[PDB]
C-alpha cells in the first residue's frame, strides 16, 4: 500500500484517508481564493491534506487535493505525506529520506513499462472540446497575476529524434480555455530541447502530468545529466518501473495512472504576462514577466479527476519538503565526495531553502589542522561551486552534538556559538543564485554579493577540544542511564 | 470552575499540582526512581519532548512521603496549550501564549501591590525540624546533571531576607547546592538586592537572617523575579500580578515572613566569612562549563514542610526550561517596556526560548519606522545603545530587528525572516565597545579581559522599509488573503471537516 501510493496518485489519496491524514471537504468552497486560503492554513497548522469534493461552478465530479506534501502536526509522523512520494513509511524523518535519496541516485534506472491503456485515458477532450476553465482552477493568492492550473506536476518533452525524453517540474498559469503560460529556462533541459525544435522551425510538442505518481514527480526533479530520461529513475527511487501510455495527440509517453494530462505544444514566439505569484522564498514580488504560450490541443483525465495544488509561500510547502529535501541530499553527496568531515546536510524548511546547515564531524576535525576562516572558505568553494549548492546562499557550519535537522537546535547553536566579530564569513566574489530575495541593485549588477558562511564551530573545536558540555538529555547523562530512561519511559507513566 | 482552579493554582503550589493532573498535564510516577541522576534525566527529557510534568512518588532512600515535581514551567507538545503550565504562574488560562503573558506582566509592573495577609498558621508549618534535627540529606536531593559539582536542594524557589530595621522584605530567585546535613552554598551577588541587604547586616557585624521558599505559590515565585526598585518588597506584587494578596506566616526561628502554602521552607542565616565551592551546574545558555566558584555558606537552623512534601526541581540546560519560560519571558516583557518608553517603533519583544536567552527579537512597526527617516546603521546603533544599556537588555548579547509582518514569538517565522532578509554585507552590526554580560558562552579570552566584544544587532529590515515600502508581499495565510476571507476560513474550519 505504501509502495502502491508511490506509483499511483489515487491510491496515495486513499492511503492518506486510511492513516488519518486526509480531510474530505464536502461543503461548498470557491476556487476563487478560498481553496488556496484553506490549503495555505493547512500547511501552516500542519493539518491533514484537504480533498475538496464540492467546488462552486466546476466540472461535476472534479476534485482538488490541497497540500500533497505538507507536514503533519504529530511530530513522530510529521514527514509521512512527504515520505510516500518516495515509498517510505509513516515514521520516516529527514535523515531516512536523505539516505534513501542518496541511494536512489546511485541505483540503476528501470525502463518504463509501456501500456496500451490506463486510467488517465478514461476521459478525452479534443481540440474544440478543450476548456480548461471548466476545471476548478484556483486563484491561489489574492494578488496573483492569474489562476494556476499546474502547480504540482511536471512537463514532458522529447528530442526531435526521440532519443531523450525529458521530465521537469514546472508551473503553468491559465491564459484562456486552451492556453497556458509558464517558465522555460533556456539552459535547463526543457529549454535545450525547445532549442532543438526551434532550429527545425518547429514549436515543441509537450504534455503536462498533474496528479502524477508521487515518485514520478520526485523523479522529474532528480539531478540527471543532459540526455538522460527521468522516467527510468522512478525504478531507481522505488525499485519498480513507472507505467506509461502514449498521449492522444503528439506521441509522448505519460504515466498511465496520472489524474490529468494536458497535451499540446510550446509556442516558438507567442508569450503572455505571467505572475506575480508566491514563490519558494515565501514572497510574492509584484512584477509580471512575459513567458511562452503552451497551447493545449487535447486533455485526458481519470473519472472524478483530482487536481492537486501547491500554494507556494512561507514554509513548509512542497518547494521545501520535496525540492529542499532533495537539495539537502545532494549537498551531502557533494560534501562527502569532497572529503569534508560532514555527516549530514539540511536545508531547513523554516529558512525557505535560503540556508543549508552542515553537521560537522567534530571527531575528525582536528586532523585537518585548520581554523574557522580557512574551513569556511574551503566549504564555500566546494558547496557553492556545486549545482545544488549554487541554489543556497547561506551555509551554517556546526558540530554534530546537535541534530541539524531540528531548527530549534540550530537556533541554539547559532545564538550561543557564532561570535559577531569572528564567525561571519561573507564571500562577495562568489556568483549568486539570482532569485535570492535580499539581493540589492549592486549585487544584481555585479552577479555576486549574497553568499555567506556562518561559523558555529568554537575555535577550540579545530583542536578537538570543547569549552563546555551540552546540558541536554543526550549529552548530560551516561549511556546506560539514557537507555534505562528510554526503555522505562512507559513504565514511568508517559504515553 | 476551571477558572476557580486556575486562580487557586497561582496561590497554592499543592493545588497547582492537582490542577495539572486534572488537565492531563501531570504524570504520576510510582515506579521507584533514583534522586541520583535518574530524576534529572527523566525531567530533562520531559522538557525536550514537552511531556507532562512528572510527580515522583517513590524515591529511593528518601524521607517517608517525600515527593519531587519536575518541569514545573516546562512546555507542552500540544501547540494550542503549549504555555499552559507557565501561564499558571501568572494566574492565566491554558490557551495563553507569549503575548498574553507579556501583556499581563507589563500591566502588573504598573499595578498597585497588595500587602501580604499575615496568618498565625499555615500548612508549611505541619512538620518542623529544629537545630540538631535538621538533616537536609533525608530529602530527595537530586544530582541533576552528570557533571554537577554537587546535589542541589534549591533549583526552584527564592531567598527571603530583610533589612535590619524591618522596613524592606526582599524575595529573590536563587539556587543552593547541598554542602552537608545543615549547610548549603549559592550565589549572593553584592550589587543585587540580597547582597545589598547582606551588606547592611555585615555593617552591624551580623550574618544575614534568611529563609528559602521551595514549592512556593507559583505567583509568589513570579513576583520574586520582578524588576522592582531598591526598597520595594516583592511580596506585595503577588497582588499586582493576580489581584489577591499572598498569605504569609512567620518562620520558626528568625522573624521572616514566608508564604503559608509553601511546600518546604529552609530557615537560617547567610555566613559572613565562610565559603564553599559551588557548581559547576547546567546553566540557562544550554552548557555545563567545567569549573565551579566559591560561594557563601547558608546555614540551616530549622526547616518546616507540608505533609507529603513536594520538592520542585529545574534541570537547567538546553531549552526550554524554567530559566527560559519564566525569566526569559519576564526579560522580554521588560525589554518591550524599555523599547516603548524610549519611543522605538517596537510593538513586541521576544527572547526566543530556543536561543537560550542569548537573543531578543524586536518586532518593528514599519509605518512608525518610516516616520523616523533613518537607515539600518543608525537605527541599529540607536537600538543597541537603548537596549544594551538597560538592566534587562544588558543580559542579552544579540538583537534581531524585523518587520511585524512576522510573529516574533514564533521561531520558525524569525528563522524565515533571518534567512531571507539579513544581507551578509550590510546587516551584521557588531558593537565591540559595548560592555558584555560575562556569562555569554561564545566570548573569547580577549573579550573577557576587555569586558566587551560580543554584542550584535542583526538587521532584517530591508532598505526600502525605512521609507515605509516593501519589495514583496509575504505569501502567508495572514498576508496573502484579505481579512474577511481569513475570518471565513477560521470560522468554517470545523465545518470543512477539520477536528
Ligand atoms: Mg533531465
Ligand atoms: Mg527586589
Residue numbers in the entry:
A (entry chain B): 0 to 494
B (entry chain A): -4 to 494
Article passage:
Here, we report the crystal structure of the UbiD-like protein PA0254 of P. aeruginosa in two different crystal forms at 1.95 and 2.3 Å resolution, respectively.
The structure of PA0254 from P. aeruginosa was determined in two different space groups, P21 and P3221, to 2.3 Å and 1.95 Å resolution, respectively, by a combination of experimental phasing using SeMet-substituted protein and molecular replacement. The refined model of UbiD2 in the trigonal crystal form contains three polypeptide chains (residues -4–494 in chain A, 0–494 in chain B and -7–494 in chain C; residue numbers -7–0 are amino acids from the His6-tag that were disordered to various degrees in the crystal), three Mg2+ ions and 784 water molecules. The metal ion is bound in octahedral coordination geometry to the Nδ1 atom of the side chain of His188 and one of the carboxyl oxygen atoms of the side chain of Glu229. Four water molecules complete the ligand sphere. The nature of the bound metal ion cannot be determined unambiguously, but based on the ligand geometry, B-factor and electron density it was assigned as a Mg2+ ion. The B-factors of the bound Mg2+ ions (33 Å2) are very similar to those of surround protein residues (30–35 Å2).
